[PDB]
């Protein structure tokens, strides 16, 4: 369900458009797809909001070009989605890499369509270590991760899964999650990892004016909690909500608090 | 600099890469080659800019494969030129079909390496008439050119030269220009005429963000001046300079004005 939207360069981008009312645009993490928000999606539809789930180029049911995995190109894709569908008063949720893409979209295309921003487990302002930012993976760790993905992607994914959740979810649940990532294009997966390693949004954060909720797991081993402290420090007017029991995947480790918090924010 | 760039399909693309300091990438019209810009190039070089004149596949000193004359593949070749020569801050000029390719390149590969766009007599947004675009050759007029190239290409060309310039230029100048086109591969010339006939960039014009200058001859019989009006309305912030005394070939009809407008814009947007 849901149409495909053409990107500026013609790539077909799959968008799931379901429910009634004010729009909630959810942007997935690396290297999954929009189905990761299934539980939130259900909860939106019964509270009377409209879920808009995009699969990035290279992921899920979208096309997978050889190019365009940098945040600029991805943010232009989001811009096209918002344009075709004529969305205003958007609650824009970016999860992990999606948080980076959401920030890039605001920076490059403006803030007037978005009434509020939610940054969840966001890979922002940087996924990797920088001067004055001694948190997260180093570029060299991301390169080792790229090496692994060129040797055995499924085993890389298994490993990533192991550090993604603080809690031990049932096997069928972990398997469903694993398979979102396995159906990603291998080359999209790789080029996005290159973008995660290199992208730096530190100069842009103090430029952000949208009302902002930051959701982040204290135990996050993928994007450390220190990222969330930096986002809150740098975005004026922002609120930090700490998920004390969660790792990166707060949408399962604390599914009810995550979705009640999302719902309460989209109302308020 | 030198020689040849590898396209995605391996086709070798000739590039005349000359000078140092800021790059001005010049994209020729159908069915000539980068040498048509010589009068402009002379001035860019004395003003201390770097001339990057691409010969498309099928033209000039480039390989002429069987396929890939569609603007998508051509725009991909331009991406290769810029990426492999590691250019940024480029002024990108497209003349005629070059105009169309320049736009497609911006749409398909983004604007991060390009500081400004010049569209000179451009074949855009469409070279042939459509639904609510009642300007230019019809599709059947371009089929007529294609048919003629399949029987007598130099005669086809002499005929095209006659509709190319508003003024009668000296016999040796016209012969020079003619011979630039006779050098073209016959089969590239045909395949690019098919892309001219069929390509349609109307949807894409409002996606262009880069600073644009439109240069166009009031008397152009090849790409009618109405194309320029359409481009100016739809490309954000574009400026329009009308060449009152020029046909399609402004680069000779108003040589001095064309060159010194181009130079000024390369100097500042």
Numbering used by the authors:
A (entry chain A): 1 to 268
B (entry chain B): 1 to 269
Paper text:
In this study, we report on the detailed structural and biochemical characteristics of an esterase (EaEST) from a psychrophilic bacterium Exiguobacterium antarcticum B7. The crystal structure of peracetate-bound EaEST was resolved at high resolution, revealing that EaEST retains the characteristic α/β-hydrolase fold with a cap domain and has a catalytic triad of Ser96, Asp220, and His248. The results of analytical ultracentrifugation demonstrated that the purified EaEST protein is a stable trimer in solution.
The crystal structure of an esterase (EaEST) from Exiguobacterium antarcticum was determined in a P3 space group. The final model was refined up to 1.9 Å and produced Rwork and Rfree values of 0.185 and 0.235, respectively. The asymmetric unit of an EaEST crystal contains two protomers. Using repetitive refinement, the peracetate molecule was perfectly fitted into the electron-density map. The hydroxyl group of peracetic acid forms hydrogen bonds with the O atom of Ser96, the NE2 atom of His248, and main-chain oxygen atom of Trp30.
